[PDB]
Paper text:
Blasticidin S (BlaS) targets translation by binding to the peptidyl transferase center of the large ribosomal subunit. BlaS is a peptidyl-nucleoside antibiotic composed of a cytosine, a pyranose sugar ring, and an N-methyl-guanidine tail. To understand BlaS’ impact on mammalian translation termination, we solved the cryo-EM structure of ribosomal complexes with BlaS, eRF1, and eRF3a in the presence of GTP. All three structures have BlaS bound in the 60S peptidyl transferase center.
3D classification yielded three major classes: In class 1, called ‘Empty-A’ (103,842 particles, 3.1 Å resolution), the ribosomal P-site is occupied by peptidyl-tRNA, and the A-site is free of any bound eRFs. In the Empty-A cryo-EM structure representing ∼35% ribosomes, density for BlaS is observed near the 3′CCA tail of the P-site peptidyl-tRNA. Hydrogen bonds are formed between the cytosine part of BlaS and 28S rRNA bases G4196 and G4197 of the P-loop, but we do not observe Watson-Crick base pairing as in bacteria and archaea. The N-methyl-guanidine tail of BlaS interacts with the phosphate backbone of G4385, G4546 and G4547. The P-site peptidyl-tRNA forms a base-stacking interaction with the cytosine part of BlaS via residue A76 of the 3′CCA tail. This leads to displacement of C74 and C75 and distortion of the 3′CCA end. Interestingly, we observe a van der Waals interaction between BlaS and the sidechain of the terminal valine (Val68) of the nascent chain which further contributes to BlaS coordination and to distortion of the peptidyl-tRNA. Overall, BlaS binding to the P-site causes displacements of up to 9.5 Å for backbone phosphates and up to 14.5 Å for the bases of the 3′CCA tail of the tRNA relative to their normal position in the P-site of the peptidyl transferase center. An overlay of a previous mammalian ribosomal termination complex with accommodated eRF1 (27) with our Empty-A structure reveals a steric clash between the distorted 3′CCA tail of the BlaS-bound peptidyl-tRNA and the M domain of eRF1, including the catalytic GGQ motif of eRF1 responsible for peptide release.
Author numbering:
A (entry chain CC): 59 to 276
B (entry chain WW): 2 to 130
C (entry chain aa): 2 to 99
D (entry chain RR): 1 to 129
E (entry chain VV): 1 to 83
F (entry chain XX): 2 to 72
G (entry chain AA): 2 to 209
H (entry chain n): 2 to 24
Write the structure that this text describes.
Amino acid sequence: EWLPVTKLGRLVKDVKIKSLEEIYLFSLPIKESEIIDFFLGAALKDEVLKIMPVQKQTRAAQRTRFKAFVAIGDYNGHVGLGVKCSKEVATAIRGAIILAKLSIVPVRRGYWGNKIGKPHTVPCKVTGRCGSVLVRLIPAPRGTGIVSAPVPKKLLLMAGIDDCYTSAWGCTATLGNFAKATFDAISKTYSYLTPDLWKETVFTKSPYQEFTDHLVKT
Amino acid sequence: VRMNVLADALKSINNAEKRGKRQVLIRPCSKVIVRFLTVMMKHGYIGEFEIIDDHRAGKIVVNLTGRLNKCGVISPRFDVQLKDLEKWQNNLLPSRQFGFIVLTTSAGIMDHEEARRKHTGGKILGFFF
Amino acid sequence: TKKRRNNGRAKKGRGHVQPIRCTNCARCVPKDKAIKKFVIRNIVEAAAVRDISEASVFDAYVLPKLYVKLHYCVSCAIHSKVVRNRSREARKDRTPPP
Amino acid sequence: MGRVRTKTVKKAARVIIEKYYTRLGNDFHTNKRVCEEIAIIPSKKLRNKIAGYVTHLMKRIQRGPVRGISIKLQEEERERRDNYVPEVSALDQEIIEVDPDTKEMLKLLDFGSLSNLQVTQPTVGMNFK
Amino acid sequence: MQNDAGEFVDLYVPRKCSASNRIIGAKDHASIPMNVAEVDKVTGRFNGQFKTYAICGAIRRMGESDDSILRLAKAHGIVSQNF
Amino acid sequence: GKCRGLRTARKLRSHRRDQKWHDKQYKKAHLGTALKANPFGGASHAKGIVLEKVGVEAKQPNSAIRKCVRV
Amino acid sequence: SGALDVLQMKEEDVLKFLAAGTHLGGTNLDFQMEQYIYKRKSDGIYIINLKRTWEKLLLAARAIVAIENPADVSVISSRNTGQRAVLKFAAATGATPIAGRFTPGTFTNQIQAAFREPRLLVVTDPRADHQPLTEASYVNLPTIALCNTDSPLRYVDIAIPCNNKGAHSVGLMWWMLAREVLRMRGTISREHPWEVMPDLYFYRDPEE
Amino acid sequence: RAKWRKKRMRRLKRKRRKMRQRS
RNA sequence: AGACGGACCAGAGCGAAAGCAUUUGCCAAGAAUGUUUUCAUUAAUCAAGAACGAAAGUCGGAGGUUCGAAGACGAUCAGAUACCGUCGUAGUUCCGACCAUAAACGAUGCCGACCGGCGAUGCGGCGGCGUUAUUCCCAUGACCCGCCGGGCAGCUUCCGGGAAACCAAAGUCUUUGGGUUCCGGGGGGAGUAUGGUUGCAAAGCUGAAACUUAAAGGAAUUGACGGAAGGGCACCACCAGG
Ligand SMILES: [Mg+2]
Ligand SMILES: [Mg+2]
Ligand SMILES: [Mg+2]
Ligand SMILES: [Mg+2]
Ligand SMILES: [Mg+2]
Ligand SMILES: [Mg+2]
Ligand SMILES: [Mg+2]
Ligand SMILES: [Mg+2]
Ligand SMILES: [Mg+2]
Ligand SMILES: [Mg+2]
Ligand SMILES: [Mg+2]
Ligand SMILES: [Mg+2]
Ligand SMILES: [Mg+2]
């Protein structure tokens, strides 16, 4: 079981907050994976991508540590990425799963041509970068499937995207950067401003502010 | 030297709006810009603009409401032939929904949709979204 | 790797500069490199002062000084322990000590 | 050939004072005994060294506070000198010395109150570069 | 976002700023909404109605949140003409 | 930068021509020097006669004899 | 926000600002603090307008009154001067104070000893108390300050032009601020003068 | 060093011109 | 008698760059500022071609203090046809013609716009309290306080970029197009061989191929090392001594 240290944890332990959307609407940081396991539970699958044995010299002999890459998603518009290094590969894997749950995001989806059914691809083309590799995601019709290397393919399905094209630039054979770039890409979909937007905001009540009463120890 | 009057202004619109400004001033104040600005405003991407007069090139001011991402120009002014629109517009635009390539033509200055509804091609100037 | 931005010499907008010669080394270096130093020392150095001024002929005899301009090489300087190496962030101070 | 005390010695000396400042005094051999009576140390020699630092420390507490030692009696004497108020200080002398530039701002702020203005002087300001 | 049956997708709609019409993201941890109180017009004494002003990170890092709110207030029947 | 006019084609087309020879593969193929110097006349296989049998030594980290023939 | 209404500079507070030198800034000027200026005199000491500095002091108060639980608010003064005022300001409205040596990580690092997640932040100086202004960027917090004419203005949302050097001016400005927040919400009438003196917030050097 | 690789060559290139001028 | 023009000499000025320092006189050019003068698109960049171009060097005269490639000696060294010391030729100096190279570096093409602040410095113009000026009050600098232009630079920042170091430009670049010029395409062979061209010679310009090879390289990190520097330490180190 788990005790929340802070405000936000105390509320989700109760039934005040109902979902994750509100948390994102106010851009609130989360620092407790016990929350993610509450809302998103058992619809969430994970996999490792690589185990990379870095090492360092000292006076006696090399000291090696194992680093790890993990990706997590539910196939309905969420995706996470996590990294961590330690000495035992299990403890390495365990912690990065926690960070991966933690730095989870939403991902937007839209249509290519005509708007019949549910969205299957991205609305608009976007890009990303991290240190000598650039990535570019492009919409496609309904049925092509994803065309890419295995890495982002493993990752884009976890968002729940169905169809897309793909291109790339630079040294793709460094997986760490090649992964984070496509994650930077699908992070910045809810930051592009379309004409679908441009309606004013209807500002809500900031959950900390509305449930002040229960928090002050009653 | 300033071999092109339209290239510089859109840059000086883009940079400012990329920063967070509310107004800008762009100097040489030529005819072709006025059409270009009118059609942007008409679709709603900017506010009004007041065009200062002097016994010279003139001057001009715009009000942004910066819901614009990028404004662009294509030079040299190429020649379109009404079957290549698709090949131009897929590899300049972000999607098949929005964004307009503007072109001069015998009827005037218009966007690509209106050109196809009037069934005529022309010469290309720029693009915005 | 530019270890410095000045490139070690305070030229900034000439084209060419005259040289000088190290006072010890005897080598030919520019005037914007070539550490400078200025001496305002006395002549008797704090030891024979009492002896002279008591064995004088005049009345307290203000006792002149000695003035010199000095030029040093970069190499000859560090060996003379005038200046010393520094760390990365502290290289960027153009202040002398008290 | 050196004698420095460690963290275990110091921290306990701090805690002992911060509880039992009344039991203790300025004599070592009494301070020795009380520490034995209240606390249960495993060793005779550790017993000794703690008290020797305690007694050195009391002489400091006599005058001048200390960083990590909060004593009641000191803290109320602080508290008195915190709540201390004078009779009057902001009513200065019924004459307020004022300059002309203020008087213009005051005049624009609609005040013809009681004030003064008797200053003119050439500019000196900054210092030698 | 609507389909051809007027439905609504895009599980939420992200709050925009008020000062640049830029969007706030799920990880822009330097964004704020800000409440301010309204008075009874006779004797102070906040009565229950307050407003909201939303700011993004880029403006708050540049050092321009001060006047943005000020001119937001200077329009809303709230801080008057300083002259 | 780049030329980028509307009637610049002769220059660009020219520039690509003289500047393509600085590629190793194109230069090798379109000049006859490698071709006339290849023992095979632009061919895959070839018949020939044996006249010796020798053993060639290998590089440093390995050590062996690789049993070749003069033909 | 000082609108045209009953609340406005009468004749008495002005005497106090002039008495303590709450209208002389320093010499150097930031380009952000150049709209709160009236003029430069002969000597390089700029005059601050006592119309905007009162019309923003109210605005800070209206922010604070929005927040019904006062203990979520936090007040900081690392410097010796604003020490006493802050402790009385905390007492006089139920805030949570932090005086001297703000330890890093107090708003991050959930498993720290003195961890606390407030909603609003008040400051005497932005150039000395520049950690929490930063740490309010890793966490959403609106930020309020007492700023002089030369003050690098960043990560902050409500600036109140004062003279943050003089002990008289500092503790004076708090006295006003504490006064309004109680007028706006409480038993203080807004007509007849409030009991305690604004000398209680001064910083007394160890002289006697 | 390259200054001396450059200089060794010229000494040689003279011997070639000198040898070749005999014919 | 012949060279050289100290300190003042500055992250100061001028020039297309190379580069420019005693006084005075003469000769002809030039930038910036100021302008309610004038002509009216006359312009930007540029294959071929043309001027200038540190030091060394070559050619013919005059001159030859100082320094000093070659060269000879004395020392150190296992050896030194080097580092050190003493002598000392070409040259270093001026007049007139050749050559056309350099880490000839801001290792960063030219033109034009846009993009954040701060305090200074140099030229010109505009203003203002006051002090001196001088000889009775003015126009000269000097400061004091600001402004404006176009300059050599500087400090600071989540502007933004970038492999990073770092940079108000190396920015406005997968949201890719302002105008135009020259040039690069794994490492060596090789700026070699040959052909043509200039030059008195030295050399310069243009410029290969067979063959060989799986790595050469850039920025930053952790150790180790150092006849590199700053603090300490030990009789399995030293001093003084048994
Ligand atoms: Mg040079
Ligand atoms: Mg190839
Ligand atoms: Mg040429
Ligand atoms: Mg020469
Ligand atoms: Mg010569
Ligand atoms: Mg001669
Ligand atoms: Mg000699
Ligand atoms: Mg060259
Ligand atoms: Mg070069
Ligand atoms: Mg680069
Ligand atoms: Mg390009
Ligand atoms: Mg090659
Ligand atoms: Mg190299």
